[model samples]
Target: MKVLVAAPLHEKAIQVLKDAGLEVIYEEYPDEDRLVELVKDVEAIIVRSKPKVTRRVIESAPKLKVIARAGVGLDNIDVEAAKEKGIEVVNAPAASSRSVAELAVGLMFSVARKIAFADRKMREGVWAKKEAMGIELEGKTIGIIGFGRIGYQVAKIANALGMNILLYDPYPNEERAKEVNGKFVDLETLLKESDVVTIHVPLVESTYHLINEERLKLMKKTAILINTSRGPVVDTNALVKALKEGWIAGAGLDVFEEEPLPKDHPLTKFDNVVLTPHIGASTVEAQERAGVEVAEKVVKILKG
Candidate 1:
């Protein structure tokens, strides 16, 4: 079997394919117009947030058997088209869980202490310590929006920090909740009760606009919010309103409705709101694990 990895892979993953006696082609950089020719002879393709492998690209490959994603989401790939073409699709959702959970925890502290702004001021030789008054996470209630792997991991850390955990996943994860000593509560209750609310749900129909104006209004005026999930999960307009009106204390965001959030975006003006480029799984450990695991899956499916 022949496989084409559209992105670079770890040495171990590349060696795995070579050991399986498969012809492996690594095209880490190729023009969009040249994708068809590059993949035409391959049985499998691997990628990580690259592009949609549409019917045009799939149809170009006579020998194609699968389109493997190195990351959790299939949003960048055309799933319907792959199904129509009889190509199996698989993704490594578990690979980036730990890395993302750590990032969320880090961001919580970043926002709580105004670390980013402080560092900037320090660099400018401005003693803004008086301007950087901070909040504390200890002895607070942290509500988790999703009870998935990353969310659960985050809950464990927050619990250890003396924050009570309140979960609001539609499908309750009783086992994980028990393991983390988290309380599974309805959304209304969680929203009203939490000292900090962190969203970890996937971006989907029901989750889109999960934190709309009504929900935002329910939160305590002193409460902080965190989102490591996809942007648009929280209505950006609603968030802006909440922040400006002091409906909630502040927010820590690693994702946004419009990525690379445009300069002069209103969200940038707020001292309480913390923003980061969407980098949920950009760590070296996360990317290397995702690349290796996905490449292994590609080889496994091809052998089958």
Candidate 2:
């Protein structure tokens, strides 16, 4: 049996395939043309965020039995194409939850305290102590838009910080809510009442552009917005207008409607907004876990 590793993977994960007596063909991030050529003789393939597995690539692999995503999101993979060929698609959805949750909290702190702005100003040899007036998170209300694994972890940490939590999810978990003393509320109420609004929903038709101009206007003018979820979940143009027109005080964003956010984009011009490349699951621990989890799944599919 053979496997094509299309993206860089952890050493331990590579060891798993080797131990299973499968020949491994490793590549950092092969483009579609290269991927098609590589998958020809492989029985399975594993990828991280790069090297999209398009339908064309899927059709080229006659022996392919499984497509494994080491991380969450299958946006890069042509799942329907694989399905048509009876190829199993597997992902390690829970592998990076904790890392992503911690990043959300870190972003909250960064925006709330203007840490990024202050650090930048200091490097420019300017004193920004007075200009960086910031609020403490100890008593603020953090409204989480999605209450799944990532949101629940955020709630647990927020509860420990003495911050009130308000969660809004289609399917509510009463037990988890009680554990964090979080109240499940309507989306409108969460936006209107929260001191900080954080997004964690998936990118789906119903959720795409879920937070638009109307929703942004509903939030308090002094409140900050944080988004670590999919970029399209919030309307980028609407968010830009909201920040520029003072509909909201500031924002902390990890993902964007466009990855590798364009140079000189409006979001970059705002000192009030803190930006990070989609690195919510960039931690060493998370990468290792995602790799191992997906590797094990691929192993099971092949061996069983």
Candidate 3:
């Protein structure tokens, strides 16, 4: 059988499929109309974040027996439609968990120390030493929303830095919290007392716009928000207002409401806000691990 590699995948991952006696068809990212043509004869389809796999695309794949996601979140894939059609859904949820957690912690350091701001000023003839005065992470309170795999890793890092860990999740893990001595608190309490808040929740109905205007207001003015999860998890409009009114200190954002940020967006105007183009799991190690994990699963499902 054949597999359609619908998104950019590691070379070694492609080798895995070939070794399993599966023919591979590769494409970077194709539109739905184009994607419809590619999946006509494939036994499995693999994708990352890009090139949305909608129900229409899934329905078009008559021979598609499995749908593989190379990353954690399946927001881009139509899982329900796949199930409806009896297609096995596979992914590498834990492959990039550490990479994402590290990025969140790195963003915290960058925001707290104004590292990005100072680096920008250095490009010019200006010296920004005075404005670069920053706070230490030690003794600071960091509220981690959604204490899952990634959140747990972040808490371990925060604990190592001598930072207090306050966690909030709909379903609490008391055993996991005890490992880092993290305090499981109510959402309101976490927002009220945290000096740095990082979001790790998935994009679900309950979590959509979880951090709204009122929640932003509850945070300390000296606090900074870091989001490496989905874009819509925090209200972008409310975030802009918080930054504008100094409700929060700053933000370190990897994900946004819109991709590419629509150049000259309001978030770009702020000196305190640090922006990245959704590189939470962009590390080389994460990419390799995710691709290999997904490839292995696809091989199993198709050959089984």
Q: Backbone clashes in each candidate structure, one number apiece?
A: 0, 0, 0
What's the CA RMSD of model 1 in angstroms? 1.6
- List per-prediction Cα lDDT, in the order shown: 0.87, 0.93, 0.94
Query: Per-residue lDDT tens digits of candidate 1, residues 182-228?
Result: 99989999999998899999888989999999999999998889999
Better of 1 and 2 by TM-score: 1
* Candidate 3 per-residue C-alpha lDDT over 1-304 given as tens digits, one digit per residue, 9 for 90 to 100: 9999988899899999999999999987999999999999999999998779999999999999999999877889988999999998888989989999999999999999999999999999779999999899999999999999999999999999999999998899999999999999999999999999999998989999999999999999999999999999999999999999999999999999899889799999998988889998989999999999999999998897
lDDT of 2 by residue, 247-286 (tens): 9999999999999999889899998899999999999999
Clash-forming residue pairs, model 3: none
Give RMSD to native, each candidate: 1.6, 2.0, 2.4
Q: Is candidate 1 or candidate 3 better by lDDT?
A: 3
In model 1, pairs of residues that clash are none
Ordered list by lDDT, greatest first: 3, 2, 1
Runs in model 2 deviating more than 4 A are: 31-37
